[PDB]
Amino acid sequence: PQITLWKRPLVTIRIGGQLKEALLDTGADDTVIEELNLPGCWKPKLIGGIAGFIKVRQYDQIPVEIAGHKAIGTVLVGPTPVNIIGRNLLTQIGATLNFCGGGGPQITLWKRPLVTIRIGGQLKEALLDTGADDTVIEELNLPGCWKPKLIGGIXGFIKVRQYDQIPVEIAGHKAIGTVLVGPTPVNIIGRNLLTQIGATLNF
Ligand SMILES: CCCC[C@@H](CN[C@@H](CCCC)C(=O)N[C@@H](CCC(N)=O)C(=O)N[C@@H](CCCNC(N)=[NH2+])C(N)=O)NC(=O)[C@@H](NC(=O)[C@@H](NC(C)=O)[C@@H](C)O)[C@@H](C)CC
Description:
It is built from two helices and 18 strands. Strands 2, 3, 4, 5, 6, 7 and 8 form a seven-stranded mixed beta sheet that branches. Strands 11, 12, 13, 14, 15, 16 and 17 form a seven-stranded mixed beta sheet that branches. By secondary structure, the protein is mainly beta. The chain has two domains: 1-102, Cathepsin D, subunit A, domain 1 (Beta Barrel); 103-203, Acid Proteases (Cathepsin D, subunit A, domain 1). The structure holds ligand 2NC. The PDB classes it as hydrolase/hydrolase inhibitor. The entry lists the keywords asymmetric dimer, covalent dimer, beta-sheet. It forms a monomeric assembly.
C-alpha cells in the first residue's frame, strides 16, 4: 500500500500465531513489541530512545506478517510504550519513504533516513521518523514565545519547549509548524511536518 501520515501509520501484524497492532517506524533501527511469549531462545539486550534505555529480550529469525507481507527477522520484546516495526523488518517488506507521491526523492531504509533541514537560519541533520507525532530539535536558541511540554518515548519523558509556526526547510521543501526543542539525542522530523512535504510510506 501507499500510506500517508496524517494519522499514526498503525498496521496489523501476525507474530507467533497472534494478531497485534504496531506502528511503522522509520526512526527505529529495530522492531520492538510489548511483553508477550515467543517460541524461541532469546538473549538480553538494552535499547534506547528519546528518554533513556529499556531492557528487552532479543529473539532472532522470527516470522512476522506485516499488513500481509512476510518478514523473518529479529524481534525485541519488552516494555515499549507502543509496538513498533523498525527498519530491520521494513527493509524486508520493501518499504520506502517517498516525497510528493513518488514524484520526489525516494529514501530506502537500509540506513537511518537522515536528511539536512534548515531551521532558525541554522542547517542541521535530522531523522525522518514516521513513529514521531511531533518534530523535536536539539538544544537551539530559537527566538519567540513558547510553552512547556513533556514528550514521551522509550525511556520515558523529556521536557521540551514548544514553539509554533516555525519555518523548517527539509531536503529543500518548505514546511512551517510546531517545533519542540530539548535534549533529544537525535533531531527528529515527525508527522506534523512530514505531511506538509507530502511524505508517504510505500510497499
Ligand atoms: C516508542 C514510542 C513511539 C516510537 C518512537 C520512535 N522514535 C525513535 C527516535 C530516535 C531516537 C531518539 C526511537 O526511539 N527509535 C529507537 C527505537 C528502538 C530501537 N531499538 O529501534 C531506536 O532506533 N533506537 C536506537 C538508538 C537511537 C539513537 N542512537 C544513536 N543516536 N546512536 C537503538 N538501536 O537502540 N517515537 C517517539 O519516541 C516519539 N513519541 C511519540 O511520537 C508519542 N509518544 C509515545 C509515548 O507514544 C507521542 C504521543 O508523543 C517522540 C520522538 C516524541 C514525538
